[PDB]
C-alpha cells in the first residue's frame, strides 16, 4: 500500500509574475484534490496586506468629482485597489500623497515610511489636467487575508466614519488568478494516472512558487495535528 510521489517537472516562467507548474504523475483522482485544495486556499485564505480605506479632500461620497483630473473618483478607487503594497513590521499604516503640476501621478510619487515600500512604482494612480490642482489622499493600509469587498465591508461596519473616507475592496491575498487543468500522464504500465498543470499569475510582492509553497505549508500545518 504505497503511493506515487511526483517530481515537479517544470516551472515555465512566462514573466516575472507568471508561472505554469507542470507536475506529474499522481494517483487517479488526486490532481483534482491537490488543485482544488490549493486553489481555495490561495483564493480565500492567503495572508497579505493592501489598501482598505482612503480619505480624500474635495469629495463627500463615492459619486462626487474633484477638478483637475481626467478620470473620476471611481477610477481613482479602482486604480488604488490595483496598487500592491507590502508592510513589514506593523499592520495598520496610513500613507498620504500630494501631487501638483502638469503630469500623471504614479506610485513613486507617494510619501513612504521606513516599513513600507511599493513593488511597482510606475503603476499609475491618476492623471492631472491642471498645474494648480493639488490632489491629496490619506491612504490607510491594513493587513488581513484573502478577499473582502467593499459591499460587505459597508454592511459590516457601523461606526460613523468622517465624511470623505472611501471604502475599497481589500485584495489581501497576493495572487490574481489561479486556474489548473488535469491532464493524463503515463507510467509504463498504468495509463490511469493524471498530471497537474497549475497556472498562476500574481501581482508584485511575491514569486508564484513562493505563493504555492506558502499555501502548501498553510495546509500542512493545518493538518499537522492528527497524523502519524
Amino acid at each position: 500500500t504505497e503511493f506515487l510521489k511526483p517530481r515537479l517537472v517544470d516551472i515555465e516562467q512566462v514573466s516575472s509574475t507568471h508561472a505554469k507548474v507542470t507536475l506529474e504523475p499522481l494517483e487517479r483522482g488526486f490532481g483534482h484534490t491537490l488543485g482544488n485544495a490549493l486553489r481555495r486556499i490561495l483564493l480565500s485564505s492567503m495572508p497579505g496586506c493592501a489598501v482598505t480605506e482612503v480619505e480624500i479632500d474635495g469629495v463627500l461620497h463615492e459619486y462626487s468629482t474633484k477638478e483637475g483630473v481626467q478620470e473620476d473618483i471611481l477610477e481613482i478607487l479602482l486604480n488604488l485597489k490595483g496598487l500592491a503594497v507590502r508592510v513589514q513590521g506593523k499592520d495598520e499604516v496610513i500613507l498620504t500623497l500630494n501631487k501638483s503640476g502638469i503630469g500623471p501621478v504614479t506610485a513613486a510619487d507617494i510619501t513612504h515610511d521606513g516599513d513600507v515600500e511599493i513593488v511597482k512604482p510606475q503603476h499609475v494612480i491618476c492623471h492631472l489636467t491642471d498645474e494648480n490642482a493639488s490632489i491629496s489622499m490619506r491612504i490607510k493600509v491594513q493587513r488581513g487575508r484573502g478577499y473582502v469587498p467593499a459591499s460587505t465591508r459597508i454592511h459590516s461596519e457601523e461606526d460613523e466614519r468622517p465624511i470623505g473616507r472611501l471604502l475599497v475592496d481589500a485584495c489581501y491575498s497576493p495572487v490574481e488568478r489561479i486556474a489548473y487543468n488535469v491532464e493524463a500522464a503515463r507510467v509504463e504500465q498504468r495509463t490511469d494516472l493524471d498530471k497537474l498543470v497549475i497556472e498562476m499569475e500574481t501581482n508584485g510582492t511575491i514569486d508564484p512558487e513562493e505563493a504555492i509553497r506558502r499555501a502548501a505549508t498553510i495546509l500542512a500545518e493545518q493538518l499537522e495535528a492528527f497524523v502519524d
Binding site: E188, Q189, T191, D192
Partner: protein, 51 residues
Amino acid sequence: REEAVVWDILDEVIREHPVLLNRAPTLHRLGIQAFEPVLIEGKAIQLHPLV
C-alpha cells in the same frame, strides 16, 4: 506477445503521424478529416465534439 518496450515504440511512431477518420456515410468532403492520435486505454475512438 506485447512486451513492455513496444508501447514506447508505439508512442514514438504515433507522435506526428496523422490518421484519416471517416464516418461511414460520407456525403461531403468534411466527412474525411485527418487527426493526430492520442492513445486511449479503451476500445472506442474518442472524437472531439465540435468536429
